[PDB]
Amino acid sequence: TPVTLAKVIKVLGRTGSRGGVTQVRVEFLEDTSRTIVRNVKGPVRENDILVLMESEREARRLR
Amino acid sequence: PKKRASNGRNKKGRGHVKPVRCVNCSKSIPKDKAIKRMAIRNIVEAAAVRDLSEASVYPEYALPKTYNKLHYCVSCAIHARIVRVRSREDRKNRAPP
Amino acid sequence: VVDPFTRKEWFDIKAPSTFENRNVGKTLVNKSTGLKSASDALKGRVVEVCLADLQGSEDHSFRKIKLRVDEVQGKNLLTNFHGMDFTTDKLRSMVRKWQTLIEANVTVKTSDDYVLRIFAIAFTRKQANQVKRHSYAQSSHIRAIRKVISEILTKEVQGSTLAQLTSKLIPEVINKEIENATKDIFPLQNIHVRKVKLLKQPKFDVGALMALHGEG
Amino acid sequence: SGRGAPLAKVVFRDPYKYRLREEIFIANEGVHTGQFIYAGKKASLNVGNVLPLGSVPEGTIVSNVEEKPGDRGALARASGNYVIIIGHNPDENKTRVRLPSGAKKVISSDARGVIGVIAGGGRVDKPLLKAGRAFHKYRLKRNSWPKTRGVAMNPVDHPHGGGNHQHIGKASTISRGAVSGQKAGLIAARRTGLLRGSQKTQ
Amino acid sequence: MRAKWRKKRTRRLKRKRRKVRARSK
Amino acid sequence: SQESINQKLALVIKSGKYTLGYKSTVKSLRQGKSKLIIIAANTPVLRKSELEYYAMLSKTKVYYFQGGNNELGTAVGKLFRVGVVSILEAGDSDILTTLA
Amino acid sequence: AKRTKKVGITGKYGVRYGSSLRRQVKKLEIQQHARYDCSFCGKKTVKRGAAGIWTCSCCKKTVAGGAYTVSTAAAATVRSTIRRLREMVEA
Amino acid sequence: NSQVFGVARIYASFNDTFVHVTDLSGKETIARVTGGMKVKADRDESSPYAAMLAAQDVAAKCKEVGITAVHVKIRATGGTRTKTPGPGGQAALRALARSGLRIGRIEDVTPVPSDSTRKKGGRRGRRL
RNA sequence: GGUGAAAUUCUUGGAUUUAUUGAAGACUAACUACUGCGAAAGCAUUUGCCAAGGACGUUUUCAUUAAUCAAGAACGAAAGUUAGGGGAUCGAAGAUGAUCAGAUACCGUCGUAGUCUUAACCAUAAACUAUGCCGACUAGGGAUCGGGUGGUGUUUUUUUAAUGACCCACUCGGCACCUUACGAGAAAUCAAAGUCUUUGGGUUCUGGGGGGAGUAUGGUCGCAAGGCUGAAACUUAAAGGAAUUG
């Protein structure tokens, strides 16, 4: 399956209207030079890995 | 009364200036008026430039930019949060930040 | 329910010998059949290329050229000039505020019947000691600049043909020509012969073309 | 007589004999005595000269254009009318032109046509004001004027006919599958009424 | 209301009364 | 870059030696005197050709005015119309060494 | 002297036929009885006979044109379009 | 430089994204697809997920025929319209890159008028 | 395609998208703007012809000719009307999909007149600088357009020259502008609405509670729509400026 693992790089801010959503950058965890910024659901810090169904959508702000 | 001396924008000696059209709403709006900006951008997004140059032949040749002027309606300008009302004294600052 | 590309061919472009890169492209057509020769259509195609991609350089990564197909031979097809241009990116990069603009244009036939409209653009600038912020002009200056531009463009185009001008404008001789001609009045940054437009062609003349070509 | 569009009496040297072959070209809005008219494939594209259609470019106009090569002139023949060229396709040499009704017609490039538009101009903007000028007009053409109305004629004389009131009774639009004696009114009317607008073909 | 439409309404009324008056020539 | 033929014509009037109208022009051009003819635009090609022939026989110069005979008469300073003018002593102008 | 505020020539039609039509006629009647200017002799001796052809009564040359006026505006556009194409061709 | 080359016209309105891949000329198109071809949602017709998902199969086809390298021209609606593209443009572009098709000579050819005909809206404009 | 979301609509006749060629009519982008010109309305592609005009250089040209103005006359956006040509887009009317309690309205699609021009008419707009014209003075301030004064300057290169524009300042008619306010005006504001109760610089129009009513009435101009002029009866105790709290 084309599923990805990616470890956090840094926190970016809490977005969306109700602020449940947060922004996070991750490192691809096998291509360290390749990073990606995305949106998440819940409590997050650095140094945690995320299982990604896409590595391309390259999310951005949200309300 | 006169909320603004110019009433408007830089006519002051002209009588008539041809109009333009708000790129958002298409309203007619004189060029003296009609907020004017410039949308300078690289086409590429920073998130993509890595894959871009990796796939790019002509290695490190250049990267062009997008150059676009943008007239605006007043109402649109305000609803864009692009321009906004200002304190009375603050209304004469003819500079950006 | 066909897979057309399992009917199609591949034709190698071969451009003039006045350039450098001639392995310019490959393009496909449906196979020539009865009552239908793919060449009949391929004779009319037109292609667009960066002059950088042509001459190997990247210093011409902004101008560009149109090439019209003229002939075919043995899975390979010969082109010829069809027009020049100037890219929008560079155009608006050049075109900023606080510098008056000028544009002129003329139309003339070569020594040969290859009639061309040719445009010229110019901006004003300041000279190294200036403080005011707009740097504009007067209409006398503008009119005389337009005049000289037209005269020079005509003088260069008449005594020449397409190949002459192609070999001029790859090295770009003519903007420096205008610069040397115009250093009297005004610096005039961003002088550029930016666009030419074919208006007419003579009889096709396979021979001139295959004389131009025919190497490697 | 019976025409706008004045006539032009051209004389040509007969190629194959010492004589002249005087002709009747329609005047084409600029013509005048002492003038020369050129005819040919190799003729100048000025006004009055007559040329094939492959021999002239797109956008050009012409009058008196033939519908077939050698019918000595058919179309764009009345006053103020003209036909516009809009294309060539040398696959079968077919020119494509636009006709005063607003019609697209595809014909032979070797078809001929005289360059310009026909005189007379706005003959039809001025009102006649009255019966007498209509009378003289239709005198010089044909006995179609005056014109009585079926709603005043008798049922024996018209299908509209009938009595106790000037009226018809049934539709005034008459299916083209119909036949003689029934064909009084509108024929194949794809609609009817007051209309808009304002092009004919597209 | 609005002055432009008072004006339009009065113009309508002028037309109407003038028609009613020229009824009697 | 250019001087107006109209002013030059006024000059040739006020100073130079000359005459008007086809007949006098041909008289002068037959006596071989006139140095410059001016001819309008509207005039018959036949008369234009006749005058051109007389000029080429007299070794005389020609100008083809860029306008009609009414305007030529206007410019030579009248209120009727003239097709042609003849000049025997091109006067205080220098038309002879112009493009003419 | 003046003899008529407006109708002029339309007085031949008296009280008849409607004012709209008489005005629409007045226009064209002036146009056609107008002694126009000749492109050839330059004079003003050009008058209609036999609607569609106008004669210069001195140079004798006839010219074809509109019925009531010499040039139709569409005919002038035609001449322009034609010379444009003539140049683009010959050149 | 054993890459064989094509060109890619990308056209991003605020409603849809058009990918279009052809030879170095316009004719003999190679691939063409939209966001609507991948979703029948009607508002996501310009979704950049859709543009990505379209560029995927476009590059697939360009390879299956045998193209390797691309030049790219791009445009908005233009004329007398926005002049600005939607978000899907850039995502389809990056998806092309990620597909592996090598790239060069990026350029914008969106149409621009010298003050051409009137615009829609009627002096007072499409108010939401 | 189009939307906030959809729908109407177009699509094996292969739409949209792609390339080429063409035609038409309109519009003159960006560059390029407290900048331009102009009695006002107003005016952007180029060139040529036509006249015209302000401002200036100005030891030139004449001698009080002149300033505002009833009557009277010219010009006069757009829309609008009459008629020819034109008719691409845009688009009242109109026809249609949605929404909505309803929507003959906003949104969407098409579309007539018109939008363009020609020949006539009209003659008004927040036709607003809602602020006349000419002169004297009040601080500066710096920009800046057009015009007029110097640099043992800059660069343009040739051997410097030369013009040349730029700058440095010197300088005038400018569109105008910033802080202050001395004066004025509650106040907003006014390089001028300043020059005034210490009341008068030449000077023309309109203005006098609100409405009724820009109606009626007539007259007059107009193809008409309508305009200019223009009341009264009757009715009635009011509407705005700034700023404060909400």
CATH of the domain at A43: 2.40.50.140
Is residue D126 within 8 angstroms of chain G, CB to CB? Answer: yes
Angle between helices C173-182 and C162-169 (to 10 degrees): 80
Query: How far out from the chain centre does Cα D76 lie?
Result: 5
Alpha carbon distance C198, C212 (integer Å): 19
| Dmax (CA) of chain H | 56
Q: Which of residues 81-120 of H touch strand I (CB under 7 A)?
A: 112-120
CATH of the domain at F41: 3.30.1330.30
Cα G37 to Cα G39: distance, rounded to the nearest angstrom: 6
- G62 Cβ within 7 A of any nucleic strand I atom: no
CA F61 from centre of chain: 9
Question: C185 forms bridges with which residues in the sheet?
Answer: none
* Nearest Cα to Cα of residue D72 among D19, D129, D111, D117: D111
Give the DSSP H or E segment for D178: none
Output DSSP code: residue B57: S
Q: Are strands B36-38 and B19-21 parallel, antiparallel or unpaired?
A: unpaired
- HSE, CB side, 13 Å, CA atoms: give it for residue C203: 3
**Strand extents, DSSP E, C160-215:** 196-198
CB contact under 8 A, D129 and G50: no
| Residue located via tokens 């000049």 | F87
Q: What is the DSSP-derived secondary structure letter of residue B14?
A: -
Nearest to B56 by CA among H103, F14, C49, A5: H103
CA–CA separation, H128 vs C207, rounded Å?
Answer: 64
Task: Identify the three-state secondary structure at position B64.
Answer: coil
Of H80, H90, H102, the CB nearest to B57: H102
Q: Is the CB of H17 under 7 A from strand I?
A: no
Q: F41 to chain G: nearest residue by CA? A: G40
CB G71 within 8 A of CB G65: yes
The residue type of H60 is A
Q: What are residue G34's DSSP bridge partners?
A: none
Residue closest to D84 by CA, chosen among D55, D44, D111, D53: D53
**Rounded-to-integer distance, Cα H26 and Cα B19, Å:** 37
Provide the pairing of β-strand D25-26 with D7-8: antiparallel
Closest residue, by C-alpha, to the C1' of I178: B92
CA C18-C19-C20 angle, 5° bins = 135
Close Cβ partners of C2 (under 8 Å, ≥ 6 residues apart)? none
Residue G9 is classified by DSSP as G
Instruction: State both tokens at C31.
Output: 């196979």
Looking at strand I, which nucleotides approach a protein CB closer than 7 A?
1-7, 16-38, 40-50, 82-93, 106-109, 111-113, 118, 128-131, 143-147, 153-157, 163-168, 175-179, 187-190, 193, 212-217, 225-227, 241-243
Rounded to 10 degrees, the C-alpha dihedral D182/D184/D187/D193 comes to -140
List the H34 CA – I31 C1' distance (angstroms): 36
Which amino acid, one-letter code, is at H33?
Answer: V
Q: Which H or E run contains C82?
A: strand C76-86
Amino acid at E14: K
Q: Where are the domains of chain B?
A: 1-97
d(CA C212, CA D130): 76
Rounded Cα gap, residues B74 and B72, in angstroms: 6
CA dist D76 and D113 (Å) reads 9
Residue matched to tokens 């062009």 = B64
Tokens coding C14: 């071969």
| Residue whose CA is minimally distant from I21 C1' | D87
Distance from residue B14's CA to nucleotide I174's C1', rounded to whole Å? 13
Mutate to test the interface with B, among C53, C58, C62, C63 (most CBs of B within 10 A): C58
* C-beta separation of F87 from F36 below 8 A: yes
Angle between helices C162-169 and C139-158 (to 10 degrees): 120
Q: How many CA atoms lie within 13 A of C129 on its CB side?
A: 0
- Residue H18 structure tokens: 């058009």
Size (chain F), residues? 100
CA H116 vs CA A12, B20, B23, D166, H112: distances in Å: 45, 12, 14, 56, 9
Nearest CA in chain C to B66: C89
By CB atoms closer than 10 A (0-12, 13-18, 19+), residue C137 is: middle
Distance CA C199, CA A61 (A): 51
Residue at minimum CA to C1' distance from nucleotide I4? H128
Q: For residues C162 and D139, what is the distance between their CA atoms, to the nearest angstrom?
A: 66
Q: Does H49 reach chain A within 8 Å, measured CB to CB?
A: yes
Distance in angstroms (rounded) separating the CA atoms of residues C123 and C134:
12
- Cα–Cα distances in Å, from H33 out to B4, C2, C29, G74, H39? 52, 18, 21, 48, 11
Residue C27's nearest CA partner among C41, C15, C13, C16 is C13
- Give every CB contact of residue C110 below 8 A, 6+ residues apart in sequence: C116, C157, C158, C160, C161, C162
Distance in angstroms (rounded) separating the CA atoms of residues G38 and G57: 10
Question: φ and ψ at B35, to 5 degrees?
Answer: -40, 130
Q: Which runs of E-coded beta strand occur in chain D?
A: 7-8, 25-26, 50-52, 61-62, 83-89, 94-99, 103-108, 112-114
Amino acid in position C51: L
Q: How far apart are CA C189 and CA C193, in angstroms?
A: 13
Nucleotide nearest to C139 (CA to C1'): I36
User: CA C210 → CA C18, C171, C202, distances in Å?
Assistant: 13, 24, 16
Tell me the helices (H) and strands (E) count for chain C, helix number first. Answer: 7, 8
- For residue H66, what are the contacts with CB-CB under 8 A and spacing of at least 6? H4
| Burial bucket for residue H34 (CB in 10 Å: 0-12, 13-18, 19+) | buried
Chains H and G touch (3+ CB pairs under 8 A): no
Residue D105 burial (10 A CB sphere; 0-12, 13-18, 19+): middle
- Whether G18 and chain F come into contact, CB under 8 Å, resolves to no
Beta bridge partners of B56: H103
Quick one: which of D42, D11, D40 has its CA closest to D24? D11
Residue in this structure with the two tokens 């019966």, named with its chain if needed = D131
Q: Which residues pair with A6 in a beta bridge?
A: A50
CB distance C84 to C165 below 8 Å: no
Range of the domain at F75: 4-100
Q: Are residues D145 and D138 in contact, defined by beta-carbon separation less than 8 angstroms?
A: yes
Closest chain B residue to H3, measured at CA? B57
Helices (H), chain D: 131-139
CA end-to-end span of chain G, whole Å? 58
SS3 C130: coil
Asked whether the bond before D198 is cis by omega within 30 degrees of 0, the reply is yes
Contact, H29 CB vs strand I, < 7 Å: yes
- Residues of chain G numbered 21-80 and touching chain F (CB < 8 Å): 39-43
The gap between the terminal CA atoms of chain B, to the nearest Å, is: 29
Q: Are D97 and D53 in contact (CB under 8 A)?
A: yes
Range 60-79, chain B: CB under 7 Å to any strand I atom: 69
Contact H19, H56 (CB under 8 A): no
User: Which one-letter DSSP state was computed for residue G82?
Assistant: H
CA distance G66 to D27: 11
E runs forming strands in F1-100: 17-20, 36-39, 61-64, 84-89
DSSP secondary structure, A14-63, as one string: EESSSS-EEEEEEE-SSSTT-EEEEEE-S---SS-EEEES-SS-------
Give buried/exposed letters for B51-65 (b at 16+ CB in 10 A, else e).
bbeebbbeeeeeebe
Determine the Cα–Cα distance for residues B96 and B37; give it in Å rounded to an integer: 12
Which alpha helices (DSSP H) does E1-25 contain, by range? 3-22
* Contact partners, residue C19, CB within 8 Å, separation at least 6: C54, C55, C166, C170
In angstroms, the CA H115 to CA H128 distance is 26
How far does A63 lie from chain H, in Å, by closest CA?
A: 16
Nominal resolution in Å? 3.3
Helix (H) or strand (E) segment spanning residue F55: helix F45-58
Classified as helix, coil or strand, F54 is helix
Nearest Cα to Cα of residue C26 among C75, C74, C80, C81: C75
- Minimum Cα–Cα distance from B63: chain H residue: H106
State yes or no: cis peptide before D90, omega within 30 of 0.
no
| Residue G38 near residue G71, CB atoms below 8 Å | no
Measured on CA atoms in the order C93, C97, C99, C101, is the torsion positive or negative? Answer: positive
Breaks (C-N over 2.5 A) in chain C follow: none
Name every residue in G having a CB less than 8 A away from some CB of D. 13, 16-17, 21, 24-25, 28, 40, 50-53, 60-69, 72, 74-75, 78-79, 81-82, 85-86, 88-89
Helix (H, G, I), strand (E, B) or coil at C165: helix
Count: domains in chain A: 1
**CA separation for the pair D52, D111 (Å, rounded):** 5
Cα angle: B42, vertex B45, B51; to 5 degrees: 115
**Which residues have a Cβ under 8 Å from the Cβ of B1 and sit 6 or more positions away?**
none
What's the CA gap between D118 and D61, in Å, rounded?
Answer: 11
In the 1-25 segment of chain E, residues within 7 Å (Cβ) of strand I are 6-7, 10-15, 17-18, 21
User: Phi first, then psi: what are they for B67, rounded to 5°?
Assistant: -130, 110
Question: Domain B1-97, what fold?
Answer: first zn-finger domain of poly(adp-ribose) polymerase-1 (3.30.1740)
What is the Cα–Cα distance from G81 to D56, expressed in whole angstroms? 13
Q: Supply the DSSP symbol for E5.
A: H
CA dist B31 and B28 (Å) reads 9
**Straight-line distance from the first to the last Cα atom of chain C, in angstroms, rounded to the nearest whole number:** 41
Please give the single-letter amino acid code of residue D45: L
Q: How many Å apart are CA G57 and CA G45, to the nearest integer? A: 6
CATH at residue H76: 3.30.420.80
H54 touches chain A (CB under 8 A): no
Inter-CA distances, H7 with C65, C215, H22, H67, Å: 15, 27, 5, 10
Task: Assess whether chains H and B touch, using the rule of 3 or more C-beta pairs within 8 angstroms.
Answer: yes
* CA dist., res. C186 & res. F13, Å (int): 44
Give the number of domains in chain F: 1
- Per the CB < 8 A criterion, the answer to whether C83 and C196 are in contact is yes
Q: Which residue is listed with tokens 């649109």?
A: B76
Q: Among all chains, which residue has been given the structure tokens 């490959």?
A: C26
Cα gap C11→C78, rounded to integer Å = 10
Look at residues C75, C94, C101, C95 and name the one whose alpha carbon lies nearest to residue C13: C75
> Cα–Cα distance between F63 and F40 in angstroms, integer?
8
Chain E meets chain H (3+ C-beta pairs below 8 A): no
Q: Which two tokens stand for residue D19?
A: 């004589």
- Domain total of chain H: 1
Pairing verdict, β H69-75 and H5-12: parallel
Q: How many CB atoms lie within 10 A of CB A58?
A: 18
